[PDB]
Design a protein around this motif. Structure first.
Motif, PDB file in Angstrom:
ATOM      1  N   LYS A   1       0.826  -1.201   0.000  1.00  0.00           N
ATOM      2  CA  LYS A   1       0.000   0.000   0.000  1.00  0.00           C
ATOM      3  C   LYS A   1       0.862   1.255   0.000  1.00  0.00           C
ATOM      4  O   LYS A   1       0.671   2.152  -0.827  1.00  0.00           O
TER       5      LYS A   1
ATOM      6  N   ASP B   1      -7.915   9.633  -0.148  1.00  0.00           N
ATOM      7  CA  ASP B   1      -7.822   8.271   0.349  1.00  0.00           C
ATOM      8  C   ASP B   1      -9.007   8.001   1.270  1.00  0.00           C
ATOM      9  O   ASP B   1      -9.954   8.786   1.343  1.00  0.00           O
TER      10      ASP B   1
ATOM     11  N   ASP C   1      -2.852   7.451  -2.024  1.00  0.00           N
ATOM     12  CA  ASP C   1      -1.970   8.604  -2.024  1.00  0.00           C
ATOM     13  C   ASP C   1      -0.599   8.320  -1.435  1.00  0.00           C
ATOM     14  O   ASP C   1       0.279   9.185  -1.521  1.00  0.00           O
ATOM     15  N   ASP C   2      -0.386   7.148  -0.845  1.00  0.00           N
ATOM     16  CA  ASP C   2       0.857   6.828  -0.162  1.00  0.00           C
ATOM     17  C   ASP C   2       1.846   6.073  -1.037  1.00  0.00           C
ATOM     18  O   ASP C   2       2.920   5.704  -0.552  1.00  0.00           O
TER      19      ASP C   2
HETATM   20 MG   LIG Z   1      -2.988   8.271   2.418  1.00  0.00          MG
END
Ligand SMILES: [Mg+2]
Lengths: 94, 184, 300, 303, 39, 103, 257, 197
Positions: C50, H150, H166-167
Motif C-alpha cells: 500500500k 484516500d 496517495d501513499d
Molecule cells: Mg494516504
C-alpha cells in the motif's frame, strides 16, 4: 492466546523523556585502579604483580586523572518521539 | 454474491430446524434493525484464500521463493488454465490455486480436495523437472571449463566470518568490562 | 467485476500471516513470504504494498505482516535470508531420505491408498483432535458427533443383524471392528476427505530424488565436502553428541574418539575458524526439521 | 562395419515407433559411418581391438585424446541404440510435428507408468530399481529429467555400483566381478566413460605435477616456498582425494547397463525442435528389458 | 447400536427396546433365521 | 593466549536441526533474545489457563503454590496473566485453601 | 515476456532461407523455431523475477557469477549469440526488397583488414578463415560457437567456445572441453584463470573483461544438420564466411571516432 | 487501514480486504476523467496550474508535469500565506509578460505590475492530508482544487476529488501523469488555434 491487553494513552501535549539514559563508557583508568586495589588486597601492597597494574595506573594518570575522555554522546530519542508522535499515536481524525 | 437486506420470514421456512423445533414467531434478532449493515463496507472473501493458506502451511519452504508484488499489467493477461505453466507468470502456489479453480469450474472433478491434489501433483512434477534441469545445467558448465568465483556456501561463510570477527572483538571487550565490574 | 480481479491480484496471492516478525524461538522453516523489488522499482520505493517503504531500506527483500496499521506504519522487516539458506541446501544437493521409510509423497501411487490397516487413532482425532478449550472441544464437538451417531443408529442395527448375527450372538471381541469399519465408510464418502494440514515432505526445500550422481570434472564424486563451522565443543550430555553449522543448517557431526586438539588449543571460540565436512545423510522429521548428519574431515 | 551393426537396424527399415527411414539413415547410419571413417583415418590398428579395450588402455592422454573421444562416442551411440526395440503405437511419421505449445504441457511421468520390466518377466531388475530408486515412477522421471536437461550432446546411464574386486588388486573372482551394491544414474557429456574408475583424479594428478614443477622452478630460482600457498594446495588436494575416496578404494567402477542419447542429431531431424520430451517419452516405451536384465550382474546383498 | 451393546454401562435405548418389544422382536427374528429348520 | 572460557550470556547456543542466519552470531541477536525473552513455557504448562476450574484445585495446595510468592502473597494479574474470571477464582481457591489450613 | 525480434525482409527469408548458407527449412529450424523455443524457455525461467526486465546480454552478465543460476545464463547466451549469427549472415539489413537494389554488395573494411594484419602473424584473411575452420573442427566436438573477438589490447583472437559460453566473460568462455584429456599448457592456463578470478575482491566474485565479438558462426547442429547433413560442418562454416554480411561486421569494429 | 477510516468517504469504498479498505475503481475512473478535462479546459483557457506534492520522492513527477503543462509545481513545503499573504511572501520575485504562444515579450514591468499578486487558476494536491493549510488558503481565495482522496481524507475540502491511494509513488505518478497529459493536450490545442484559427 489471552495475552495481557494493550493500554493506550489520552492525547498528550508531547512525548519525551526527562533525562534519557544515554550510553557511556568508563575511563577504565578507575577500573585499572579497581584491579590494582584487588591485587594489593590479595597479593600484597605494591606486590610484584601489582606493579604491572601500578604502571597501568601511571600511564592512565600521567596526562589526565581520568585519562582521555571522549565518546560523550547524547540520545536523540526525544527528537524522534517529537518527530513522529503525531503519526504513531493513532488519534481519531478531526 | 451474498445479498444484504434480506430477512428470512417465518413463513418462508416451514420445516423443523436442526433441533426439530418449528419456528413459529420471529426471534430477538428479527426485531432489531439492520441499517448499519447496509451502510457498513462489505467484507470481501474468496475461497482461494483458504487454499493459499493451506498450500503455504503445507509447503513452508515455498515461502522462501521471492515473489514480486509489482503488477505489470493485470488487464493484458490471457491465461488458459488447462495447463498451469503459462508464459508471463512463474510457477508458484497461485498456479496450483488457479488450476484448482479451473478444474472445479469445468467440473472435471468434484470437491475442493480432489482438484487440489490433482493440481498439487502436477506442481510437484514441474518443480522436480526444473530442479533437475538446474542441477544438470550446473554440471554442464563445470564439465566444460566454467570458472566460479564465489558460491553460495562461501558467500555465507565469508559474511559469517565478518560477523564473527566483530563478535570476537565485542566479547573480549565485554569480558574485560565484566572483569572490571566484578573487581569492585 | 472488480472482486474477481482483486482475488487474483498479487497482494491477494500472498496468504494472510500474523506470526511475529521477530521470533525468539526455534526456527524450522520459513514463516513469511519474501517480497522482492526490482532495482528500478526500489529506486522509487514501489515494493507493491500500500505505502512506499522508507528510503533507508537498501535491501531488496522484506517480510511483512500488515499492509497498514493503526500507527500509520507498515509492519515489515527487510530480512530475505531464507532463500539463501535454501540455495545453500541445493549447493550441497544431498537428497532428502524419508525417516520412517515412507515412500515419496510426490507420487499419487495407485496402490498407496489401497494397502491400509485399521486406524482407530483417526477415530480419536475426529473429536479430540480439536485440542482447544474444554467448554467447546470436550462438550460442543462431543455433542455434535453424538447427534451424528443418532442418525446412524438404525442403519447399523439392521446391517449387523442381517450380515453378522453370529458375532453379535457370541459377543465376540471382534465386534469393535465392524463399528470402526462402519464409521470409516460413513466418513469416507464423497466430500468426507475434508482437508489435512501437514508438511507433505521436503516441503519445497528440495525437489531432488535420490540416485543421481554428481559427475564432476575430476570424476564422479563419492563423498561431498562443504566448508562449515563447529558450533561448540560442549556438545550435549557429554554423549559425544556435538553440533555444527553447515551452510545455513545446524547439523550434528560424528567425531572419532579423541577429537582434534584444536579445540583444546582454543575453546568456545572454535566458531572463528572453518573446517571441511562430509554430509552423511539428510532426513527430515515431523516438525519440518532436517536432521542432517555430517562428519569432520581433517588432514592426516 | 559388421562389428558395428545391429540386428534391429536395417537400411531403409524404420525402427517402429521411434524413427522413419530418414531418421535412422541420418541419426545412426550417417553418424556411425562418419565415426568409423574418422577413426580409421586416425588409426589403422583399430578394427581388431574392441572400443572398450581401447578406452581402458588408452586414456588420460592429451596427445591421443581424439582417438579416445571418437571411439567412446561410437561405443556410446552403439550401446544406446542396442537396447531399443520399437514401440507398437504412435508411428514416428504418423504423429504431427510439435509446436511451441508442447513446452507448456505438464509432464505425466508422475501419473502414467508404462513399459514395466515386470511385463517382460524380469523381476531381478524390478527389485533392483525399486531398491535403488524407491519406485519405477521415480526412476523413470529421473531418467527423463536428467537426459532432457542435457543442453548438447550427452548420455544418461543406468550404471551399477560394481564393488571393486579388492580395490582392483584382484579380478575374475567367483561372483565378485559381477557383484554390485546399488544402481545410480550418471549424465555423461561429449564422450565421457560411464565407468569412472579410469579418468578419476586426472585433475588431481595434473595439479600435483604442476605444483611439483612450480616448486622445482622456484628452488632453482631460489625463491623460498610460501607456507600459505602450500596450505592452500594441501586443502585442494585433501578435498580432491576425499571427494573420490570410496570405502573399497581405487574409485568404484560403474558398468553401463542402459543409455539414452541426448544429441539433437538423433531427434531434431524428425521430431522437430520441441519434440525432445516426446522423443524421450517414445524411447521409454521402446526398451527391451531382457537385454538390460542380462547385463545386470549379481547383487551384494550377501553381507 | 445402543440396546445391542455388551457394556454394563448402557443408555436409555436399551429400555426403549425392552418396553417397545424391539429387542425381543430382533432376537426372535435372529432365532427364526438361525435356530429352526437349519436346512 | 586468550582465555578459553566465555559466559553463557555471550555465547548463543544454536539449537540442532534449525535454520540460522549470519546475524545470529552477533551481539544483536543475544540482546534481542534477552529483551524479547518470553515466558511461553509457563503458558504451555499453566493448567490454570488450560480451561480448568481454579476453585476445584483448592484441595491441591501445590497447584496453587506456584501462584504464590515466597511468603504466600498472590501474584498480580500481570504476573499470572490469567483471565479476570480465572484469576478471581484462583484467588478464592487459595484463600479457601488457607482457611482449611493447607497453606 | 521475451519475444523473438522481427527481422528485415522477413517475407524473403520465409520463402527461401539465407542464400548460400541455409535452406528455407534450415533457417526456419534456427530462426522462427528453436528461437521462439529459446525465448519461451527463458521467459518461463525468469518470469516473475527481476531478471525478466533485462535484455539477454545484461542477464547473462549478471548471472555469470551465480553457480546454480546457470540455466538462465545458458538460455540468454544462446539467444544473444544466435541473433548475432543471424544478423552477421543476413543478406541485406536495409529494407530494399521493394526497390530490388540487388547491386548492394558487402566487402571488408580497410580498417578491418588492417586489424587482421596486426593480429596473428600478418596472415591474409583467407588463411585466417582456413585456420578458423581448422580449429572449429578440431576443438569443438559437439555444439558450440565460433568467435572472432577483440580484446582491450587491440588484437583479434579466435575463441573456440564449446558451449553457450559468451566471449564477453572469459570465466564463462567454455573454450576447453574438460571431459576429454587436457594438455599441460591448457591446464596451466585454466589454473591461471582460477588465480585471476580469485584475486578479485568484489563480493560477487566478478572480473573485468571486454572482449566483445565481431564474427559469430553458429556451430549448433540446429543449423547444418539439415542443410549440410552430418560431418559436413566444415563446408557449412566455409560457405558461411564466404557470403558474410560485412556492413554489420566492419561496423562492429570500434571506429575510433 | 480500517482502524484509520474516515466515515465521510463511505460512498467511495468498495469494501475491506486484508485489513485495508478497497476503493471503488469505477468511481475513481469517473472522477479522474472529470478532473482530467477540468485541467485540460483550464490549460486551453490559458490559466496557471499549480501541482502540489510534499511527500518524499514525488519531485520528479511534479517537475515533469509542470513542464509538460507549462504550469508550476511546489515540491518543497507549502508556505502558509502564499495565497492570502502573497504580497509579503512572493512579492520579491519577478514576473514576465507572455503572448498567446507562451513566448516572453521581453518588456520591462512597472513596479505596480510586479507588486501585484498572481493567483493559480487550478491547484492539484497529491497529499491533501498534510497540506491542509494549502487547501484552506485555496477555499478562502476562491481557487478550484483537485486532490487524491484516500480513506483518510475529507472529500468536501476539494472541488474535484479523485478517490485513490496517495501513499504510493506509482499511484500518484500514474494519476498525475494522466492529468499532465490532459493539460498538455489542452495546451497543444490552444497553440494550434492561435497559430491557425
Ligand atoms: Mg494516504
Amino acid at each position: 492466546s489471552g495475552k495481557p491487553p494493550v493500554y493506550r494513552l489520552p492525547p498528550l501535549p508531547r512525548l519525551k523523556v526527562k533525562k534519557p539514559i544515554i550510553r557511556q563508557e568508563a575511563n577504565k583508568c578507575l577500573v585499572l585502579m579497581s584491579n590494582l586495589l584487588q591485587c594489593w588486597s590479595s597479593y600484597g601492597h605494591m606486590s610484584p604483580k601489582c606493579a604491572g597494574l601500578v604502571t597501568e595506573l601511571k600511564s592512565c594518570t600521567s596526562e589526565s586523572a581520568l585519562g582521555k575522555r571522549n565518546n560523550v554522546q547524547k540520545s536523540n530519542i526525544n527528537y524522534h518521539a517529537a518527530r513522529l508522535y503525531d503519526r504513531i499515536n493513532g488519534k481519531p481524525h478531526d | 454474491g451474498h445479498i444484504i437486506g434480506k430477512l428470512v420470514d417465518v413463513t418462508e421456512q416451514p420445516h423443523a430446524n436442526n433441533k426439530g423445533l418449528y419456528k413459529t414467531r420471529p426471534n430477538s434478532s428479527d426485531k432489531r434493525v439492520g441499517v448499519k449493515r447496509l451502510y457498513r463496507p462489505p467484507k470481501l472473501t474468496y475461497v482461494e484464500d483458504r487454499l493459499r493458506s493451506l498450500f503455504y502451511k503445507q509447503h513452508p519452504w515455498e515461502l522462501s521463493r521471492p515473489k514480486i508484488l509489482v503488477e505489470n499489467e493485470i488487464g493484458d493477461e490471457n491465461y488458459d488454465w488447462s495447463h498451469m505453466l503459462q508464459i508471463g507468470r512463474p510457477l508458484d502456489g497461485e498456479s496450483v490455486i488457479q488450476r484448482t479453480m479451473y478444474l472445479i469450474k469445468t467440473k472435471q472433478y468434484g470437491d475442493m480436495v480432489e482438484a487440489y491434489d490433482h493440481a498439487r501433483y502436477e506442481f510437484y512434477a514441474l518443480r522436480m523437472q526444473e530442479e533437475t534441469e538446474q542441477q544438470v545445467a550446473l554440471e554442464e558448465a563445470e564439465m566444460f571449463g566454467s570458472l566460479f568465483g564465489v558460491s553460495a556456501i562461501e558467500h555465507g561463510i565469508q559474511k559469517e566470518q565478518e560477523v564473527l570477527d566483530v563478535w570476537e572483538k565485542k566479547v573480549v571487550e565485554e569480558t574485560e568490562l565484566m572483569a572490571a565490574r566484578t573487581s569492585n | 467485476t472488480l472482486a474477481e480481479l482483486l482475488g487474483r491480484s498479487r497482494i491477494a496471492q500472498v496468504a494472510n500471516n500474523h506470526k511475529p516478525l521477530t521470533y525468539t524461538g526455534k526456527k524450522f522453516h520459513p514463516t513469511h513470504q519474501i517480497i522482492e523489488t526490482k532495482p528500478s522499482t526500489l529506486y522509487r520505493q514501489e515494493w507493491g504494498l500500500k505505502s512506499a517503504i522508507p528510503s533507508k531500506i537498501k535491501s531488496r527483500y522484506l517480510v511483512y505482516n500488515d499492509l497498514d496499521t493503526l500507527e500509520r506504519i507498515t509492519t515489515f522487516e527487510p530480512r530475505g535470508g531464507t532463500q539463501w539458506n535454501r540455495l545453500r541446501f541445493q549447493e550441497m544437493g544431498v537428497p532428502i531420505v524419508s525417516n520412517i521409510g515412507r515412500q515419496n509423497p510426490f507420487f499419487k501411487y495407485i496402490s498407496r491408498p489401497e494397502d491400509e490397516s485399521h486406524a482407530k487413532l483417526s477415530l480419536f482425532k475426529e473429536m479430540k483432535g480439536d485440542t482447544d478449550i474444554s467448554p467447546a472441544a470436550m462438550k460442543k464437538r462431543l455433542k455434535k458427533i453424538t447427534a451424528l451417531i443418532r442418525s446412524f443408529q438404525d442403519e447399523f442395527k439392521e446391517w449387523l443383524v442381517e450380515n453378522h448375527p453370529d458375532e453379535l450372538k457370541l459377543n465376540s471381541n471382534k465386534l469393535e471392528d465392524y463399528v470402526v469399519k462402519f464409521l470409516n465408510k460413513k466418513l469416507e464418502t464423497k466430500t468426507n476427505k475434508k482437508f489435512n494440514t501437514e508438511i507433505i515432505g521436503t516441503g519445497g526445500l528440495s525437489y531432488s530424488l535420490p540416485g543421481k550422481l554428481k559427475n564432476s570434472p575430476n570424476g564422479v564424486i563419492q563423498r561431498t565436502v562443504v566448508p562449515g563451522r563447529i558450533l561448540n565443543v560442549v556438545k550435549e550430555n557429554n554423549d559425544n553428541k556435538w553440533l555444527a553449522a553447515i551452510g545455513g543448517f545446524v547439523a550434528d557431526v560424528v567425531f572419532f574418539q579423541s577429537p582434534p586438539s584444536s579445540f583444546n588449543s582454543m575453546g568456545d571460540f572454535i566458531r572463528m575458524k572453518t573446517f571441511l565436512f562430509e554430509i552423511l545423510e539428510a532426513s527430515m522429521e515431523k516438525n519440518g526439521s532436517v536432521s542432517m548428519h555430517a562428519r569432520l574431515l581433517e588432514p592426516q | 562395419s559388421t562389428r558395428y551393426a545391429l540386428e534391429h537396424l536395417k537400411e531403409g527399415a524404420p525402427l517402429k515407433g521411434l524413427f522413419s527411414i530418414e531418421g535412422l539413415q541420418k541419426a545412426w547410419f550417417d553418424r556411425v559411418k562418419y565415426l568409423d571413417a574418422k577413426l580409421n583415418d586416425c588409426t589403422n590398428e583399430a578394427q581388431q581391438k574392441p572400443l572398450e579395450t581401447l578406452i581402458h588402455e588408452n586414456s588420460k592422454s592429451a596427445s591421443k585424446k581424439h582417438i579416445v573421444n571418437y571411439a567412446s562416442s561410437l561405443y556410446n551411440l552403439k550401446f544406446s541404440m542396442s537396447s531399443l526395440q520399437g514401440c507398437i503405437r504412435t508411428p514416428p511419421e504418423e504423429c504431427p510435428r510439435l509446436g511451441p505449445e508442447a513446452l507448456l504441457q505438464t509432464p505425466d511421468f508422475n501419473r502414467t507408468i508404462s513399459n514395466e520390466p515386470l511385463t517382460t518377466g524380469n523381476e531381478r531388475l524390478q527389485a533392483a530399481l525399486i531398491s535403488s530408486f524407491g519406485s519405477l515412477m521415480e526412476f523413470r522421471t529421473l531418467l527423463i529429467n536428467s537426459n532432457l536437461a542435457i543442453s548438447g550432446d550427452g548420455f544418461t546411464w543406468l550404471v551399477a555400483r560394481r564393488q571393486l574386486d579388492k580395490r582392483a588388486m584382484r579380478n575374475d573372482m567367483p561372483n565378485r566381478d559381477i557383484e554390485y551394491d546399488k544402481l545410480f544414474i550418471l549424465n555423461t557429456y561429449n564422450a565421457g566413460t560411464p565407468f569412472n574408475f579410469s579418468t578419476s583424479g586426472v585433475m588431481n594428478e595434473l595439479n600435483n605435477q604442476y605444483t611439483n614443477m612450480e616448486k622445482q622452478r622456484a628452488k632453482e630460482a631460489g625463491n623460498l616456498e610460501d607456507s600459505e600457498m602450500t596450505a592452500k594446495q594441501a586443502k585442494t588436494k585433501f578435498i580432491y582425494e576425499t571427494q573420490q575416496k570410496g570405502f573399497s578404494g581405487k574409485e568404484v567402477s560403474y558398468i553401463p547397463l542402459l543409455a539414452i542419447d541426448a544429441s539433437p542429431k538423433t531427434w531434431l531431424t524428425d521430431y522437430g525442435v520441441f519434440g525432445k520430451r516426446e522423443y524421450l517419452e517414445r524411447v521409454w516405451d521402446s526398451i527391451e528389458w531382457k537385454i538390460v536384465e542380462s547385463r545386470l550382474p549379481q547383487r551384494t546383498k550377501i553381507q | 447400536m445402543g440396546s445391542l451393546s455388551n457394556e454394563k454401562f448402557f443408555d436409555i435405548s436399551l429400555v426403549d427396546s425392552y418396553l417397545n418389544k424391539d429387542l425381543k422382536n430382533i432376537s426372535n427374528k435372529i432365532d427364526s433365521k438361525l435356530n429352526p429348520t437349519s436346512n | 593466549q586468550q582465555t578459553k572460557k566465555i559466559d553463557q550470556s555471550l555465547s548463543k547456543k544454536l539449537p540442532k536441526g534449525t535454520i540460522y542466519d549470519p546475524f545470529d552470531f552477533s551481539m544483536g541477536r543475544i540482546h534481542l533474545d534477552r529483551k524479547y525473552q518470553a515466558n511461553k513455557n509457563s503458558n504451555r504448562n499453566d493448567i490454570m489457563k488450560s480451561g480448568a476450574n481454579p476453585l476445584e484445585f483448592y484441595a491441591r495446595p501445590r497447584i496453587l503454590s506456584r501462584y504464590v510468592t515466597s511468603t504466600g502473597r498472590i501474584q498480580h494479574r500481570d504476573i499470572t496473566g490469567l483471565s479476570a474470571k480465572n484469576q478471581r477464582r484462583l484467588s478464592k481457591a487459595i484463600r479457601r485453601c488457607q482457611a482449611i489450613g493447607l497453606m | 515476456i521475451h519475444v523473438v525480434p522481427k527481422l528485415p525482409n522477413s517475407k524473403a527469408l520465409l520463402q527461401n532461407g539465407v542464400p548460400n548458407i541455409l535452406s528455407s527449412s534450415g533457417f526456419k529450424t534456427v530462426w522462427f523455431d528453436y528461437q521462439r523455443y529459446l525465448c519461451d524457455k527463458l521467459t518461463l525461467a525468469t518470469a516473475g523475477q527481476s531478471l525478466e526486465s533485462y535484455y539477454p546480454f545484461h542477464i547473462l552478465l549478471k548471472t555469470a557469477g551465480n553457480p546454480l543460476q546457470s540455466n538462465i545464463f545458458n538460455l540468454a547466451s544462446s539467444i544473444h549469440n544466435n541473433h548475432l549469427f543471424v544478423e552477421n549472415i543476413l543478406p541485406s539489413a536495409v529494407e530494399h526488397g521493394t526497390n530490388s537494389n540487388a547491386v548492394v554488395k558487402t566487402e571488408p573494411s580497410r580498417l578491418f583488414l588492417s586489424k587482421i594484419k596486426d593480429s596473428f602473424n600478418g596472415s591474409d584473411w583467407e588463411v585466417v578463415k582456413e585456420e578458423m575452420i581448422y580449429r572449429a573442427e578440431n576443438e569443438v566436438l559437439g555444439q558450440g560457437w565460433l568467435f572472432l573477438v577483440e580484446n582491450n589490447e587491440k588484437k583479434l583472437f579466435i575463441l573456440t567456445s564449446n558451449n553457450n559460453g559468451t566471449p564477453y566473460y572469459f570465466p564463462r568462455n567454455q573454450s576447453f572441453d574438460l571431459n576429454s584429456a587436457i594438455s599441460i599448457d591448457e591446464f596451466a592456463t585454466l589454473k591461471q584463470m582460477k588465480e585471476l578470478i580469485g584475486k578479485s575482491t568484489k563480493l560477487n566474485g566478478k572480473v573485468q573483461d571486454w572482449t566483445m565479438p565481431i564474427i559469430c558462426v553458429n556451430l549448433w547442429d540446429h543449423a547444418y544438420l539439415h542443410d549440410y547433413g552430418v560431418g559436413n560442418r566444415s563446408k557449412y562454416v566455409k560457405n558461411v564466411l564466404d557470403n558474410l554480411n560485412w556492413s554489420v561486421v566492419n561496423n562492429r569494429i570500434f571506429s575510433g571516432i | 487501514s480500517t482502524s484509520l477510516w474516515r466515515s465521510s468517504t463511505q460512498s467511495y469504498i468498495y469494501g475491506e480486504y486484508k485489513g485495508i479498505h478497497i476503493i471503488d475503481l469505477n468511481q475513481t475512473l469517473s472522477y479522474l476523467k472529470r478532473a482530467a478535462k477540468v485541467v485540460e479546459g483550464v490549460s486551453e483557457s490559458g490559466g496557471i496550474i499549480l501541482f502540489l506534492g510534499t511527500r518524499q520522492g514525488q519531485k520528479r513527477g511534479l517537475e515533469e508535469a509542470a513542464k509538460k503543462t507549462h504550469g508550476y509545481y511546489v515540491s518543497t513545503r507549502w508556505i502558509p500565506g502564499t495565497l492570502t499573504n502573497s504580497t509579503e511572501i512572493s512579492g520579491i520575485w519577478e514576473k514576465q509578460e507572455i503572448d498567446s504562444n507562451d513566448n516572453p515579450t521581453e518588456r520591462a514591468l512597472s513596479p505596480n505590475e510586479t507588486s501585484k499578486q498572481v493567483k493559480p487558476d487550478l491547484l492539484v494536491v497529491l497529499n491533501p492530508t498534510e497540506n491542509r493549510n494549502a487547501l484552506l488558503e485555496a477555499i478562502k481565495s476562491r481557487v478550484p482544487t483537485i486532490a487524491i482522496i484516500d480513506t483518510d481524507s475529507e472529500p468536501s475540502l476539494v472541488t474535484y476529488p479523485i478517490p485513490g491511494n496517495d501513499d504510493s509513488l506509482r499511484s500518484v505518478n500514474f494519476l498525475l501523469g494522466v492529468l499532465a497529459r490532459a493539460g498538455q493536450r489542452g495546451l497543444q490545442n490552444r497553440l494550434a488555434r492561435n497559430n491557425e484559427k
